[PDB]
């Protein structure tokens, strides 16, 4: 109900005033704020419904348009209209996000989704919804080979959203095949990669950023030189829009992630010459200090270079590369410091991930080498780097323990969010030094809630949900309680701040309940962390660069839901205790973990044995040796079946080997009476009435009926003197009756 979007949204307003006109203004402001929430619920809804609905092929898909209509407890509905109430671009950006979620809702294994099906589902009028739907299908891995017939039909209009959706989705479906017929499409789209001297063709900058990321992700694990060098030049070089030179931070960030992904896992070298040359070239970019700002190497390329040196040595444990990336707080706080401070959080997050063994789970790792060291404890710009220090370390902390679950990390994040929550969005003394610092606080508290949601993924935690609910609701900010274009820009900054504050809480909401809680993220395969890391990129500040990439954690999501089914009946049986053998995420020996039946077990590679025990079905315990892992065992399916035990009269011939505890016997009788409430009606009673329960006694009575030949006489004697059997005394006592009884 909190996350639903295809309905009027419940609102609560402070309105700490009595004037009617003032109250209406705040309600309109809250309506505009809630309109932002509706636009940005696309990220949340995508994770809530991952592979829920299945396609019928013949059936036609439907996409619910954005409602963005707010409802107050007073039931005086206020309806937001574009572009009078909110920025015009926001409304169809939310439509595009909703379209991606709808497109992603289709399962990966679904068949029948060919190039004709999308054309069949075309709304005959291109819009943001279809562009998102086009992105979702390609993102899921359905656009493996899209026909060239309607590629031009989609791309003929210069609309950005549809072109963005096609380029990202189509590249994602193929994902590293290095096909020429598709790579040339982006090559035409990208203006700088187009041959030099050609007359400029009008291509939107966001489209190029869409083209460059799709193309780099087209070249995944290619390690491909004639493209990688061109990408490196693209990051350094300068662009052209509207016939005038321009430098974009968004494109350079898109270029940096593009280069890093193409050469992912290419840094574990002890090709090295060109890799070392590219490594030192990137380090020159990130470490160069310029007293005078050069035009063609601005600070905008710093983030792309860091995210490039991110992915090259991912999981490489190269201490030296981390050191020249890691920044020491003690030395920098003494100095004036240089470059954008936002580079620091990327740099430290870069160093921490290189050492993919030393990500500390304790607060000491977070708080390592941090001290205010100044009398002026008031919030001042001098102490921003430690905040960006904090954000980078915790983000690496959260991604490291992704979906694995824990308690110490959760408690530490709970303490951190509790401390930083009250300061959030507090424009008390309107001072820019204070205002810039608290903007970083907003960025920091967005990182903490995301990371806290990351580590506790798919758990449906209470307090984590409790906090993210808080950051979800109440706009707060300058309005409520706690020259025309200028006021437009002044309102534009605040409305954009609320949009960035909402995307983080929405993303946290979706990850708490991923795939209805039965799907979990992957951090085993090398590229999964790459997609996890890229999608978790904090771009919450204006202009929210590269936002459409938020719907890309989908490659890292999978089963790891385990359930039990019966064999003879073939139906599912649940609510049986399951004991698990784990490594406690550390080198410790083991801890027994008891869980219910429909529960998300930890990663298969860390599990050594699993056993099922419950009153009734006989136990089944399997231990995983080095030869076979749990992943290989569950490769055919994540479901293991169990055989039913039998309460047969024939089992208890004369004596009961069963203990027959009084409590379970009373429970069984009560259970049977419940069905009886909702007698010789059972065939077992019939065979009991026949008096032929004892199989052996009956047979020997028939055999002894008459003789007593020596061979058979010794046979019965052998059965009488059996080392182990059941009704031995009954057998002994029959033969005595036969031998010396009345006749």
């Amino acid at each position: 109900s909190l996350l639903a979007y295809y309905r009027p949204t419940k609102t609560q307003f402070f309105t700490t005033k009595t004037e009617y006109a003032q109250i209406l203004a705040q309600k309109k402001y809250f309506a505009k704020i809630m309109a932002l929430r509706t636009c940005t619920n696309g990220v949340g809804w995508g994770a809530v419904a991952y592979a829920t609905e299945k396609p019928i092929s013949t059936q036609k898909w439907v996409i619910q348009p954005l409602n963005l209509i707010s409802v107050f407890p007073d039931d005086t509905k206020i309806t937001v209209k574009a572009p009078e109430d909110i920025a015009h671009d926001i409304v169809e950006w939310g439509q595009f996000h909703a379209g991606v979620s709808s497109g992603l809702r289709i399962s990966k294994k679904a068949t029948g989704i060919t190039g004709s099906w999308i054309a069949f589902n075309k709304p005959k009028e291109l819009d943001a919804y279809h562009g998102g739907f086009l992105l979702g299908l390609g993102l899921n891995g359905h656009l493996k080979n899209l026909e060239e017939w309607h590629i031009y039909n989609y791309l003929s209009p210069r609309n950005t959203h549809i072109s963005i959706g096609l380029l990202l989705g189509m590249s994602s479906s193929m994902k590293g095949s290095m096909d020429s017929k598709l790579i040339k499409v982006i090559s035409v789209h990208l203006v700088a990669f187009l041959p030099s001297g050609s007359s400029d063709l009008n291509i939107d900058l966001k489209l190029q950023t869409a083209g460059i990321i799709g193309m780099g992700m087209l070249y995944l694990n290619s390690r491909h030189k004639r493209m990688s060098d061109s990408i490196f030049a693209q990051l350094v070089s300068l662009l052209n829009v509207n016939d005038e030179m321009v430098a974009d931070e968004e494109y350079r960030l898109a270029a940096g992630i593009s280069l890093g992904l193409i050469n992912l896992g290419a840094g574990q070298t002890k090709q090295n010459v060109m890799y070392e040359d590219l490594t030192t070239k990137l380090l020159e970019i990130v470490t160069s200090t310029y007293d005078v700002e050069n035009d063609w190497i601005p600070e905008n390329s710093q983030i792309g270079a860091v995210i490039a040196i991110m992915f090259l040595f991912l999981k490489s444990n190269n201490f030296g590369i981390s050191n020249m990336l890691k920044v020491d707080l003690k030395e920098i706080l003494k100095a004036n410091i240089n470059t954008r401070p936002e580079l620091l959080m990327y740099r430290e997050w870069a160093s921490n991930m290189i050492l993919w063994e030393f990500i500390g789970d304790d607060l000491s790792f977070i708080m390592k080498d941090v001290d205010i060291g100044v009398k002026f404890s008031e919030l001042n710009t001098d102490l921003l780097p430690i905040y960006y220090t904090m954000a980078g370390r915790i983000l690496a902390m959260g991604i490291r323990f992704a979906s694995t679950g824990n308690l110490k990390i959760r408690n530490i994040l709970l303490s951190l969010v509790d401390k930083f929550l009250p300061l959030y969005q507090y424009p008390g003394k309107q001072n820019l030094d204070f205002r810039l610092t608290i903007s970083v606080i907003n960025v920091l508290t967005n990182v903490i809630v995301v990371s806290l949601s990351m580590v506790m993924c798919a758990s449906g935690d209470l307090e984590v949900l409790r906090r993210v609910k808080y950051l979800h609701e109440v706009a707060s900010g300058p309005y409520s309680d706690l020259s025309d274009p200028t006021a437009y820009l002044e309102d534009k900054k605040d409305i954009d701040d609320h949009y960035g504050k909402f995307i983080s809480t929405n993303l946290a909401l979706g990850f708490l309940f991923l795939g209805s809680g039965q799907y979990a993220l992957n951090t085993s395969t090398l590229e999964s962390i790459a997609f996890l890391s890229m999608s978790v990129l904090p771009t919450y500040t204006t202009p929210h660069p590269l936002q459409e990439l938020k719907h890309f954690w989908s490659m890292a999501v999978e089963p790891r839901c385990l359930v039990i089914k019966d064999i003879s009946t073939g139906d599912a049986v649940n609510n049986v205790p399951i004991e698990l053998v784990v490594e406690e995420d550390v080198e410790k020996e083991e801890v027994i973990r008891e869980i219910s039946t429909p529960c998300l077990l930890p990663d298969f590679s860390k599990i050594k044995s699993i056993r099922v025990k419950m009153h009734g079905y006989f136990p089944l315990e399997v231990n995983f040796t080095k030869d076979y892992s749990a992943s290989d065992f569950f490769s055919g399916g994540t479901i293991i079946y169990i055989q039913r035990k039998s309460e047969s009269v024939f089992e208890n011939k004369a004596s009961f080997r069963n203990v027959e505890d009084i409590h379970v016997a009373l429970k069984r009788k009560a259970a049977e009476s419940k069905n009886y409430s909702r007698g010789n009606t059972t065939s077992s009673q019939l065979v009991e009435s026949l008096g032929i329960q004892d199989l052996t006694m009956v047979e020997l009575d028939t055999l002894l009926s008459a003789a007593l030949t020596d061979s058979e006489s010794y046979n019965l004697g052998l059965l009488c003197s059996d080392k182990n059997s059941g009704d031995i005394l009954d057998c002994q006592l029959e033969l005595w009756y036969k031998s010396f009884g009345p006749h």
Binding site: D291, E293, N380, L432, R435, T542
Partner: protein, 218 residues
């Protein structure tokens, strides 16, 4: 110790007194007809018919040397500049050439923007702008808003400037953001000129400068 420093980085109950901000943007008065100690601090050339341009060119100089007379460091040429658009007649060099006769003119959309983005973290303390109400009434900047931030991403509103009558250098030192430091600490500064006097279209910029703190042989 770990907890106490986190409290210093994150003062939860210590900071927020009442949470009762007015949230309105403060407006700075630039008029030169009233004499006050605070105005004299920000207005340098002194309060005064319209002077002829040669007096304007004259007074343009003493305002320069008076600002340069005090112990101060000029880093106007230590950053990259990118206006909204040129007019192919005069780049921002004629605005930063410290010459009244030459000036820079933009030509494009009504909300003209002037970008001052720095390479390194430099702490600016005094902001110097020269205006000419009578020499450039057609293109006089009537409405000025200065931003602040550490990057083009995080540019934020800093101060309000309404222009009624200023023929002279305007000194803009920053005290609101940091009362302890009495200076501004940002790497990204941008200026907007959304409207001119008497409903003008374009805007000049006669002078601009940036101030930061810190016999011979031939």
């Amino acid at each position: 110790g770990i907890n106490k420093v986190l409290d210093h980085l994150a003062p939860s109950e210590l900071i927020k007194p009442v949470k009762s901000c007015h949230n309105k943007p403060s407006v700075l008065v630039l008029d030169d007809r009233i004499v006050d100690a605070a105005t004299k601090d920000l207005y340098v050339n002194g309060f005064q018919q319209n002077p002829t341009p040669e007096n304007l060119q004259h007074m343009f100089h003493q305002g320069i040397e008076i600002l340069d007379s005090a112990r101060m460091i000029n880093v106007t040429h230590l950053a990259l500049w990118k206006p909204s658009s040129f007019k192919l007649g005069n780049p921002v060099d004629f605005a930063l050439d410290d010459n009244y006769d030459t000036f820079w003119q933009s030509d494009g959309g009504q909300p003209h923007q002037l970008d001052i983005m720095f390479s390194k973290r430099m702490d600016i303390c005094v902001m110097a702008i020269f205006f000419s109400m009578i020499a450039d009434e057609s293109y006089a900047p009537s409405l000025v808003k200065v931003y602040a931030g550490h990057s083009p991403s995080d540019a934020r509103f800093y101060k309000m400037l309404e222009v009624r009558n200023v023929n002279g250098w305007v000194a803009l030192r920053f005290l609101d953001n940091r009362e302890d430091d009495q200076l501004l600490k940002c790497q990204f500064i941008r200026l907007l000129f959304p409207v001119n006097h008497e409903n003008g279209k374009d805007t000049h910029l006669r002078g601009i400068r940036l101030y930061v703190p810190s016999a011979i042989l031939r």
